[PDB]
Amino acid sequence: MREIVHLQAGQCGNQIGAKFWEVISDEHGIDPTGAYHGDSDLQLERINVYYNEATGGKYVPRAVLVDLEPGTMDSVRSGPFGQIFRPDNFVFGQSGAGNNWAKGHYTEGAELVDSVLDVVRKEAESCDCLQGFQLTHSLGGGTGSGMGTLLISKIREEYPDRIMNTFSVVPSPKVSDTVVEPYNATLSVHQLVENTDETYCIDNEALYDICFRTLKLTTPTYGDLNHLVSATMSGVTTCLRFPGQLNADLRKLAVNMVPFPRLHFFMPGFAPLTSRGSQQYRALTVPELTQQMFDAKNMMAACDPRHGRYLTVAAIFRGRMSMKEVDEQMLNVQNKNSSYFVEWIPNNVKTAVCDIPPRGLKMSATFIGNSTAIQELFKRISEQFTAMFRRKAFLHWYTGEGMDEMEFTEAESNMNDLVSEYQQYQDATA
Amino acid sequence: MREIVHLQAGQCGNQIGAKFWEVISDEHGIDPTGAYHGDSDLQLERINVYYNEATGGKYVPRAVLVDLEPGTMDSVRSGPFGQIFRPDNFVFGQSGAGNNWAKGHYTEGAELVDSVLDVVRKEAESCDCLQGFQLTHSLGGGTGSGMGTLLISKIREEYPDRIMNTFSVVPSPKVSDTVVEPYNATLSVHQLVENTDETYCIDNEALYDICFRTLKLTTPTYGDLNHLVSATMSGVTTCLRFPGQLNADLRKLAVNMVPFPRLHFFMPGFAPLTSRGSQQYRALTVPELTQQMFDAKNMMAACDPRHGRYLTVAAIFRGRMSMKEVDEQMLNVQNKNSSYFVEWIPNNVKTAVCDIPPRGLKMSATFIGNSTAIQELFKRISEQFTAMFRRKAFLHWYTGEGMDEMEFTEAESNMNDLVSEYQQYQDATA
Amino acid sequence: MRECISVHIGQAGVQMGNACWELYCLEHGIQQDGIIPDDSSFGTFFSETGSGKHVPRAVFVDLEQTVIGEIRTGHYRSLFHPEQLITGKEDAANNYARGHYTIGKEIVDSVLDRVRKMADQCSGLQGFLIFHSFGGGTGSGFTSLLMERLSVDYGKKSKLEFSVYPAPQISTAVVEPYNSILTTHTTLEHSDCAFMVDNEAIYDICNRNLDIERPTYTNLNRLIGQIVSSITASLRFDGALNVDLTEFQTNLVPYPRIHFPLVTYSPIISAEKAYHEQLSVPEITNACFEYSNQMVKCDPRRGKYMACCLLYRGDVVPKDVNAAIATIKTRKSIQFVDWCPTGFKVGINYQPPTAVPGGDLAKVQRAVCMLSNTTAIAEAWARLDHKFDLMYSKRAFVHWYVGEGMEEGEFSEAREDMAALEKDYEEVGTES
Amino acid sequence: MRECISVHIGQAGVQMGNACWELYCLEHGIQQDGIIPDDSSFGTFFSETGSGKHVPRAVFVDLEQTVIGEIRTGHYRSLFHPEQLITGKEDAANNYARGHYTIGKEIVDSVLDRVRKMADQCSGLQGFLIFHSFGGGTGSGFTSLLMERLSVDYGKKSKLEFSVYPAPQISTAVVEPYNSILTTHTTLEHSDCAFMVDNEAIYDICNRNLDIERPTYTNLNRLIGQIVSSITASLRFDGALNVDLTEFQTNLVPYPRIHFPLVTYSPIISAEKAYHEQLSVPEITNACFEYSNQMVKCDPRRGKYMACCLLYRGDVVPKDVNAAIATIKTRKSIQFVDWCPTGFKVGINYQPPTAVPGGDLAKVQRAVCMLSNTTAIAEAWARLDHKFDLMYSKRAFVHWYVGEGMEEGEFSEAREDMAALEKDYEEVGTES
């Protein structure tokens, strides 16, 4: 029960999703061929959350991989753990989006979105108790921002009550990798703010720092970052798959992390993260794991929480731990950094403890934080969006695909309101 | 409990500190790799004072090594007992200070001081009961005088109640090794007199004499002197780590050794110190150990106490001793040299006896003396400072880094007042 | 799954194309024929046949038959399908009218047919690659004639072109201003992105960086071939961050009438002097923005960048790319336009560049090709327009063009259109 | 982690630099190429490449191409990166104006570019080392031209220079006073510390202490190389009391306009006569302050010391250094200025000096290099100024300088500036 159906999009989604399924299979003892060879029996009890069963023990991930070009998917199946997926789930077009939201949303992805739903509905209908949909994409691209938001809107109109959680890679502030990011990001956020229950913002610049500072890695491939993103994705869905002292369902986090409907953007974090040489200089106990989770340098988003306040926070622990220490340490943070937590929420921390830790680790903890500091990210995008749009920087690539200039104004205005709403709630009572 | 956090600075601090940790590890049975292989169990009971624990028995010193150049630290880790430290504690810059206090205090160390605190606070926050901070540096250099005083000011503004004890290498009178010592020393003392509870003045000229006269050593390396400085540093913190008949906490010494707030400069001493060939011509009993402690030739400071009076004195004994002899011998000194002790303090001697002696020794004793004779040191620096400053000897290297000529005048005036204060209290009642 | 139709017009295109397909054949293990010895990503460029023969997806067209005849007798004689190599009767004699109106009217239909047969043989059409000279003749009339036909038959499909833009001082034809401007007027509305290269610039690179005092056109073509291999590398090979030919359009073209990026290829280093260079990512990235390494003799710092695409190859760590670009953003001399806060498009590929045997370039580990759109190129048009005005005031060579199907009015229209384009750059280059 | 950019200008710098990098290569096990045989502290001076080739972090620049061409054909042909060795068309012909205004204006930009590429390849910039002649030509015009450019592009970074100061009696050029004064005027405000050496002084040492009656410039260069090795030894090797290149500035420069220390290297002893010397620390230390061993023919006892730096190497006990300096402080003949009670800066290193094969110096155990700032050098400027005044009164050679970009006014300004500097020394040398 509580089955989750995995949806991909764009080059970013398939790459992250591919590493997501490699990790999930590893902790469930699933071979790349699809067979089960695990040791513990608990990992097989709740395997229906992510996998479907077939004859001979083969387990088929409940994943839908989609993009407007076949190249990335061809890489996925060829690579390790690529044969695991069911072939029918690869819904791909021929002409890719040129990194323009209009093409992937109105023109190119429009003629392919119908096929994707035919696979989603067949997947969704096969669940005993559907919990929700998990989506991974990037807001700066064309397929992700355009088609990903198109898929979200269709699903939210077809499964209104289910939970839609999206792990979106957000453009970094320092340097970009697509010239038209402000157009794609602003248009995508105009859709997410209405049709997803929780979004986890991550930017590559933040994950580079985590590897450079913490992991002390000198050749960080995109695979390395995807592993970190996979770990946070894995952590938030541990209660559904393993026993624990205090469980936290996906809908349980949203209630504790989303005060108001439009403020559903979080910045995740993970711990512990130590270099191979620094493993022997740590106690690896509960007090220190909680210490770095709230550290600004151990968060997978560019925004620094010191610039704002935490509306809410969630800490999902893994491994056998003293519940007293978890309660004590969490309270300690609430006390010292009382200036960092909003004052009209008496308690901002939600604690969950899964019993089984990730492979090779005795302890783990995943941080989720809803902070007014995230308004910094949106304002930066708004500043770049208005600079380009003030003199029609690249519109003809978008207006020529079917969009209209009014849509850009609506997206900017809606983006501005969200920034204002975050700022309004950063002021204390009265 | 009563944990001490060790802070380094400059080339001098790292060299002395490196030898400090080699000795401390030796008496606690800690291998250079970090494992414990001691014989007695007492040395492991209070190991938390200087070491933190990790998995597999590895013990991590609570030390912070910092300097504005990587060269000295690279030597420290490469050398013996260099792998013991946690890598994160090495906070180093790229452009070193040119032996000018201004650069290490205002310009170069300013952009690095913040990182050091991030390591200190993480270290300090991990103590069950923080006693204080122990700092080793040199007043004649740039990083030590500038950055060391910068670190002291930040800590004293962040931990006002904790005790800050500094082991500072003071410029020698005979010959110098830095042309601008008077500027660096005067500026540093202007800071220490306000932001440290006790400073232990040592000069290399004094330690050369101790080796030449007492130890009869013909090739004294800087390592040899560092061992003597390590021994006095080790002795003053034996009560915290071992049992004894009469214990003396670090705060216990300051109360008994610091009559007035600004007169917190001591000149230490150690005993016994015998050459390899003269070991067989000594009884090595309490009466003789006390005899040489008050001898002017067995003190690690240039100033001779015969030129002044002892405000207070502390004698920290180690090893199993007859408490009667300690009391009798200490009283005997008070009687013969009654002209050498101030008269408005009825009792000037503080006695402490630790039960366990240093490795290879049956007995030991560490002398600490607050004497008005130390005004000789400051007046000598003041004489050299005014000679140079009278005609702008080297100011442009300091004023160009951000300082102002008014700061030099304030430092000289504050230095002059301290000399006056020592002289005022050298006159008997009325 | 992907595809590209390479159309090579005029002597410049055919000779440049020969270097390209020599390099493509090397990169895929092909053996100078359609055969592969006893290698799987060739589908983008090379068609396959049951005999094991791979047929290039290219069309070699020239109103002159001298250069194409050399191919039919060269080492690549058995590589191309014979009907692809289309040869006219007589050349255009460096006359735009002959290529566009009189001669081109008898060959444009034939080449279009072969494109049609190739177009419907593709699983999915991605775009075209057009190689032609800007000097004039077939490269100006026929190319403009062919481009307008494609704009109708294939409409919104991408049409990329690489052009040998006239050099500032060096010149080989007396009537380049007439032909260079005329082709621009008839190709602005039919081309998506035009990549510019000048022989003088590559001559400077070949002697300033490669230690060769005798550059031939073969040397320049191989340098141009490497650029094209990098642009199409994303399709041909796997990588961490792929970029497609449809992306260059929205990434480098801010306005429909301003689609003329410059070209740069950083690790142009001799074999001997490569031993004394670390060739790390940051240094090669910084080399792109120097005036000394532009493939078009137009100094970028005279104007403002407005869009840049970086295409990395080989053993490249994306973290260094992030660091390397950010520092370039910091420099105050490297000025970007106000209205483009997001300046860079980044693509990374795992295939290191292949060195052609007998070549001059070193066996580099990692390489970067930069496609930068800058207002500095507005100066090049101004210089070209200045030369055109001098001749036209005297009607220096008009009678040749007027008497071969063209009209006196078109000269005025073409120059006036260029004047607006020069003015268009000024508006883009000014903020508030 | 540390770095130093060595810039060698003119024939004196290039020939002196050759001795330096021959010595550096020996001290690190390098094999006359970038290769190291089948050695870890070279990072300060030598860059590294994956091939195992170490590229010197130096720039050899000369408006003449004769000397640099010899390097390209010498045993160190494969050591330097070719673009580092920059050669002009024609020499400055011993004319300051040609080096500074006419010729230098066509090469200064090229050398600055290579420095820029080296500057941003360093983990952290520590300073520069400039080797040049004071006689004139490139060593005066180009160096002054280059120094002022560095003062802007790199600002507060250290800029140390070693100069071949003109000898009192021996002279090789007729117009040295013009060039020697002109470079001083334009380098006082752009240089941090200038180390002086005279050929006559080293000639005296080479024949008075080394038992060689035929000193060549190779002999002098090797003696100068040892001095530089000691100055940069602290960075290259471990020691008890290290000294950095930024420390010399505040330790030896009491005022901005007085930064001309002398140079001394004590254990200059022949191999045969070393067997009859104990070579203990106290004796070598006392040898530094003798007039007979100064590398600049200026007697210190004619004036007052104001700052001294002692750099010990090899098996040296710091206790002896403390004792040795104190006794020197006692002597009444060794007079230090009143306002500098703290006279000495001491640095100790564990690496004994390496004797170049075929060299003249003995296989010493411990060595000391002294950098002393003294008012005695004011006499040298006075002698140089006296020579300048004689020629200028007659306008002996002015037309050469005036006709090649310079002006008659600069001669007066330069001499007047020197007059103030001579007066500045007098004020420093008097107390109360």
Ligand SMILES: Nc1nc2c(ncn2[C@@H]2O[C@H](COP(=O)(O)OP(=O)(O)OP(=O)(O)O)[C@@H](O)[C@H]2O)c(=O)[nH]1
């Ligand atoms: N890079 C490069 N440029 C070339 C090459 N061949 C010719 N060009 C350029 O082309 C210009 C000369 O015009 P052509 O390309 O020969 O004109 P065409 O294609 O022969 O057309 P017609 O004049 O009608 O024969 C010169 O300015 C050259 O820059 C080549 O092999 N490589």
Ligand SMILES: Nc1nc2c(ncn2[C@@H]2O[C@H](COP(=O)(O)OP(=O)(O)OP(=O)(O)O)[C@@H](O)[C@H]2O)c(=O)[nH]1
């Ligand atoms: N120590 C040392 N000094 C040299 C050497 N070569 C030349 N000099 C000095 O340089 C002076 C002569 O001027 P040059 O250095 O040759 O001038 P340049 O660098 O050739 O510049 P131009 O005159 O323009 O060619 C003489 O006074 C010498 O003292 C050398 O190899 N070693």
Ligand SMILES: Nc1nc2c(ncn2[C@@H]2O[C@H](COP(=O)(O)OP(=O)(O)O)[C@@H](O)[C@H]2O)c(=O)[nH]1
């Ligand atoms: N973590 C991660 N991020 C990626 C990867 N590939 C692309 N991205 C991000 O995705 C953005 C590019 O958008 P993309 O998904 O390629 O556009 P689209 O696929 O055409 O819709 C870039 O800003 C990258 O930061 C990957 O493999 N891993």
Ligand SMILES: Nc1nc2c(ncn2[C@@H]2O[C@H](COP(=O)(O)OP(=O)(O)O)[C@@H](O)[C@H]2O)c(=O)[nH]1
């Ligand atoms: N005991 C001891 N003293 C030292 C050592 N190294 C330097 N010193 C002293 O430190 C002073 C030099 O200051 P230094 O610390 O090097 O300046 P900085 O590091 O740049 O701030 C000298 O006067 C020496 O007496 C050492 O290894 N041991």
Ligand SMILES: [Mg+2]
């Ligand atoms: Mg032709």
Ligand SMILES: [Mg+2]
């Ligand atoms: Mg010359």
